[PDB]
């Protein structure tokens, strides 16, 4: 990050920029972009260093410096922004050519910021390469009284793809899809490869009597341990597993419960999860909250998110997906996108609405949507 190349980014913006546009990124009012913008052209940065309001006429940090500073805390930002872009870029395209090495097609593109592999039918016809990964069949471990669709047998095969390569997955399946399903035969397809858990699933509370449901029926070979009740009921499920007496496959649990009080929080963290399901997971779109440092704290190998809405054009919350799937990205500060965090909406600016906002959230859906993995109803029918 250079600082010669900043503060040339910062003049050239200061002398391109609409008035409107100035107080999108900077957060100044209307009137104080109005004056800077008609105080340019700039020549060097000393020139917009110099520009202050006047002092009334007669009937604390002056507007220069205080942009001039806000701006180039931005730039920064931007910078940071782009580095994670092109390391999702490189990521990728790993995933991109593992799915081309498959032999399957792809009906989306990525300026929709997602994926949309919907049958495999010309595999069915013609047969699985010798040279290809993908498995056809349900996994053994599932219930043989339960039929996965083939979007659902792509859908386990792109997880496991994206469990190989060490990334993380966002499934963004429309809702009624069987996202639930298709985790659940994701760790029977696991279990088949002598990978066994510990795993995690958090979800609503809502949900979770149909998470056990699940379990029983599509996948009764998993145990699974409920880690929920009073904080009684809690010590004493911690005292139960701790001494390994009978271990287990699959742990669920809440987001209260696993993000709220120091016990249970580093109890997950002890347990070494292998896979960690974060269900209706919208807290991983604002990485501006304490919940969140909490839930990306815990350790796991593979993360996956499940989600019914496709990504938003929303620069804050693709930076928090950008910290969920990268590697080793939440471990780094980050301290230099603290600024766009803290730009705060409001009628007279958005810093979603400035222009090199815009363009960061075109470039980054566009990267990111080898990490999503989303069918619709009207596909899949």
């Avoid at 399903?181 to 979800?203: E, R």
């Avoid at 958005?350 to 990111?368: G, I, P, T, Y």
Wanted: proline residues 5%.
């Amino acid at each position: 990050i250079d600082t010669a190349a900043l503060k040339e980014e910062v003049l050239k913006y200061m002398n391109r920029c609409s008035t409107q546009d100035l107080a999108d990124m900077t957060g100044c009012t209307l009137a104080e972009a109005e004056f800077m913008v008609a105080k340019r052209p700039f020549p060097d940065l000393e020139s917009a260093l110099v520009v202050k309001q006047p002092r009334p006429v007669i009937p604390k940090t002056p507007l220069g410096p205080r942009l001039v500073g806000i701006c180039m805390e931005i730039m920064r930002g931007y910078f940071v922004v782009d580095a994670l872009i092109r390391q999702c870029e490189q990521l990728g395209g790993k995933i991109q050519r593992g799915i081309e090495a498959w032999g399957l097609s792809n009906t989306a593109t990525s300026d929709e910021g997602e994926t949309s592999l919907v049958n495999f039918d010309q595999m069915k016809s013609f047969g699985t390469p010798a040279n290809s990964s993908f498995i056809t069949t349900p996994p053994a471990s599932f219930s043989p009284d339960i039929k996965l669709q083939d979007y659902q047998i792509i859908g386990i095969n792109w997880l496991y793809l994206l469990y190989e390569l060490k990334l993380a997955g966002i499934l963004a399946d429309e809702m009624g899809l069987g996202k639930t399903c298709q985790t659940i035969a994701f760790f029977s397809l696991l279990m088949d490869k002598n990978i066994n858990g510990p795993h995690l699933v958090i979800a609503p509370a809502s949900t979770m009597e149909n998470w056990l449901r699940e379990f029983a029926k599509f996948c009764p070979k998993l145990k699974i341990e409920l880690y929920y009740g009073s904080q009684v009921e809690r010590e004493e499920i911690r005292e139960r597993i701790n001494s390994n007496k009978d271990s287990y496959n699959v742990m669920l649990t809440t987001y209260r419960l696993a993000a709220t009080s120091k016990a249970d929080r580093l109890f997950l963290r002890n347990q070494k999860f292998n896979v960690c399901v974060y269900d209706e997971g919208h807290y991983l779109k604002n990485r501006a909250s304490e919940r969140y440092r909490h839930l990306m704290s815990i350790p796991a190998d593979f993360r996956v998110l499940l989600t019914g809405t496709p990504l938003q054009n929303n620069l804050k919350e693709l930076i928090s997906l950008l910290a969920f799937i990268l590697p080793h990205v939440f471990d780094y500060g980050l301290k230099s996108l603290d600024v766009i965090f803290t730009m705060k909406k409001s009628p007279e600016s958005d810093f979603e609405r400035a222009l090199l906002s815009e363009q960061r959230v075109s470039r980054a859906k566009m990267m990111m949507a080898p990490f999503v993995l989303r069918r619709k109803k009207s596909q899949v029918l």
